[PDB]
């Protein structure tokens, strides 16, 4: 069946969805992956057929209000997830011209989107087909939500629509011990890496007597590390390696390390998350739950990250909280079976 | 686990060895593919680890044996079966240090290669760990493994060896109406699509009211798009960026881009026409020293191709034309759709690493 992929949220819902876009055209449907022009090159380089649906200066223009007038800032934590939801409904607004042409020659029997990839739900609703979404669940849903229909309501009441349609299925790829306690039974899902690659080298997949640090990436600890006879390797951009620096393929090197320092950013955390490696993040919400559960540290200064990094190397809780974390994400169901349920729900409906 | 892919010769076999790659690696093993040097960047592409395990001056084997011997080019399909055995043989001997140097750092838990990928069955047997071969038709394979052995006898024997090992499993994507009634058993498998990608652009997925005809080439085109006028065919060319200065031609998604055709006339190299078989579309083959040319004869000989003795035109005509053509790709097409998915052999793979006593 065809499958239409629609990644318009951040740009790491792109790696989040590719492992079940892989599994589903992997299973021979044929499958597209939609996103922002410039996530195009990452859907494209991990193999997917990639489409363009918006241009690059969406994420800047849609912080304006829909008649062009600037917004005001969010002044608490709740306008902050009611002014993000705007700003996904306006994202998904500006993704559905493409949508609606791509849509109208290649005509998708299921629509899978992200978190907040609202597009997909709209575009759905309008085809009359089934639309999953998929997760790391956060409990925000219930306000990011009401706030993206709130924009969405000419593309709503177009279609008769009070609000923005439920999924028929949601996936989640929140590791159950840091799922919100309160949060509804889900579809689970491990997520793997599913991306692009360049040629190995042998330092890559080589363990080493001594500890290797990754830090991701550029834009005191070596120092430290120095002191732990620990091999430190930078991911970086190609230019700008001029420690070990530039191009890593996380899925390959991250098993071979100790720990990995990261930013926030969703792609480190997850492939730690199932390698198993302790994390060090420099500031999401993610994070801080990973920090919740002892698997990582979330720190403020060089000298706050070179104590966190030897902790995380030197206290061996950090380690196994890691470890049994990724047993724990090990036994959820495989992006391949997650394609048998998208399959069921084209066909097992009440006839 | 570790599962080391191997694939041996033309950008044919990655792409063969790609789909059931892509699965263990989706599946959530680690996963790296070797090839010669100048093949890696296909493996890459396709989103699978990629390894460098031979230079690509290895080639040259075609020619010269180990000892330094010219070698003589076959003269009759007989003798390019022999040929081809020795060849493959000779390029696996010289795999063998960088494959040893990897799996000394990385050690694979099983190991599969490609139908003449024999490194791959010599470096399981050295490591002591199972080899899956995957083949199109392993009913085939009697010509070529005798050769080969042959070849490698120095590199057997010192694994205490007579002839290359059984493989612990074989995996056949030949459909099973194409395959001998005497082949031996295997996993079958539906190979599917694992390839790179770029952009699409909306022609690519758009169907329109005018046949569509995709021509796959790295002549008896120019005269086949005028004869295409007549039946204003859109004409699309899988080449070359640099070729395709010189009908829309280039780059092309054949995943994508091959649904929408009427007909794909390629040169029995093996990726257009597995796509074929797969998608449901009928084939205008043109036969020249191609890999995959016993295959175009049995799918022409089920109806669902025709193989040209070079014409072009007319033949053409027929597969656009006469409904059987269509009608057969399609049966072909359905069938191939009930075999085991690449995610499915993963479980089989999986079961082979077990010591059964515990």
Redesign the interface.
């Known amino acids: 069946m065809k499958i239409l992929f629609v990644a318009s949220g951040s740009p790491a819902t792109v790696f989040a969805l590719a ?1 079940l876009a ?2 589903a ?4 449907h ?1 499958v ?1 992956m939609g996103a922002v022009e410039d996530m ?2 990452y ?10 649906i918006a241009p690059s200066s969406i994420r800047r223009y849609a912080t304006m209000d829909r008649e062009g007038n600037p917004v005001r800032m969010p002044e608490t934590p709740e306008e902050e997830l009611d002014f993000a939801g705007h700003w996904f409904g306006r994202m998904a607004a500006g993704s559905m011209d493409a949508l609606r ?2 849509t109208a ?2 005509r998708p029997d299921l629509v899978v989107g992200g978190s907040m990839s609202f597009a997909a739900a709209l575009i759905a609703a309008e085809l009359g087909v089934p639309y999953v979404r998929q997760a790391w669940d956060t409990g925000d849903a219930w306000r990011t939500d009401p706030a993206a229909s709130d924009e969405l309501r000419p593309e709503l009441r177009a279609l008769g629509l009070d609000r923005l349609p439920d999924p028929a299925l949601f996936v989640d790829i929140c590791p159950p011990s840091l799922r919100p306690a309160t949060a509804p039974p889900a579809q689970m899902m ?1 997520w ?9 080298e ?1 330092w890559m ?3 080493g007597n001594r500890p290797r640090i990754l830090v991701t990436s550029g834009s005191g600890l070596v120092a430290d590390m120095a002191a732990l006879d620990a091999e430190v390797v930078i991911a970086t951009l190609d230019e700008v390696a001029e420690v070990r620096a530039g191009w890593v ?1 996380l ?2 090197v991250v ?1 071979t390390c100790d720990v990995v320092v990261h930013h926030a950013g969703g792609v480190t955390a997850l492939t730690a998350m ?1 390698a198993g490696v302790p994390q060090l993040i420099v500031p999401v919400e993610a994070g801080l739950r990973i920090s919740d559960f002892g698997a990582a540290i979330t720190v403020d200064t060089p000298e706050a990250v070179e104590k966190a990094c030897g902790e995380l190397i030197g206290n061996p809780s950090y380690a196994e909280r890691a470890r049994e974390l990724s047993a724990e994400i ?1 036994a959820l169901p ?3 079976e997650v ?1 048998g349920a998208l399959e069921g729900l084209v066909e097992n409906l009440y006839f």
């Open positions: 492992p892989t599994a055209r992997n299973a021979g044929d597209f195009v090159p859907i494209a380089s991990a193999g997917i057929p990639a489409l363009s042409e791509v020659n290649w491990r793997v890496p599913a991306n692009g690659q360049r040629r190995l042998p997949y080589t363990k393929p899925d390959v098993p199932n090990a495989l992006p391949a394609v």
